[PDB]
């Protein structure tokens, strides 16, 4: 049966909150994470990261009704942030941005659900 309207509305609002988020410096943290690096330019990314995912793919899964619960969506957002932390150095801007986006996802979920 189709996802109920409440679930659909919740996923769009949560992902939009994460993608649109700007820190105290005015920087949109999601920017680098929208699209994966190219397989031709950065093959080492695909050698180390077993399940690559980006926000474009998460938005595709939301659009095509693939997530059946908020937990399903959370699993992919957490995977994206975990991959950023696996590939990139601890303490780097991209590693630290992914930790902030995990927090933004959780806070947005608490406000809509
Ligand atoms: O884990 C990630 N790490 C990175 N990096 C790092 C590799 C090393 C540098 C940062 C990216 C770098 C790019 C360049 C390409 C060429 N033009 C500039 C930007 C593009 C996407 C990148 N990207 C992700 C994109 C989506 C999801 C995840 Br979870 C990641
Ligand atoms: Zn549809
Ligand atoms: Zn794990």
Numbering used by the authors: 1377 to 1489
Task: Give the authors' words.
We aimed to achieve orally bioavailable molecules that selectively degrade the BAF Chromatin Remodelling complex ATPase SMARCA2 over its closely related paralogue SMARCA4, to allow in vivo evaluation of the synthetic lethality concept of SMARCA2 dependency in SMARCA4-deficient cancers. Heterobifunctional molecules co-recruit a target protein and an E3 ligase, resulting in ubiquitylation and proteosome-dependent degradation of the target. The synthetic lethality between SMARCA2 and SMARCA4, resulting in sensitivity of SMARCA4-deficient cells to loss of SMARCA2, has been discovered and validated by genetic methods, but pharmacological validation and exploitation of this synthetic lethal relationship has been hampered by the lack of suitably selective small molecules, in particular for effective in vivo use in animal models. We found that design of linker composition and exit vector placement could be guided and rationalised by ternary co-crystal structures, yielding molecules which exhibit high potency and suitable pharmacokinetic properties to translate to oral in vivo efficacy.
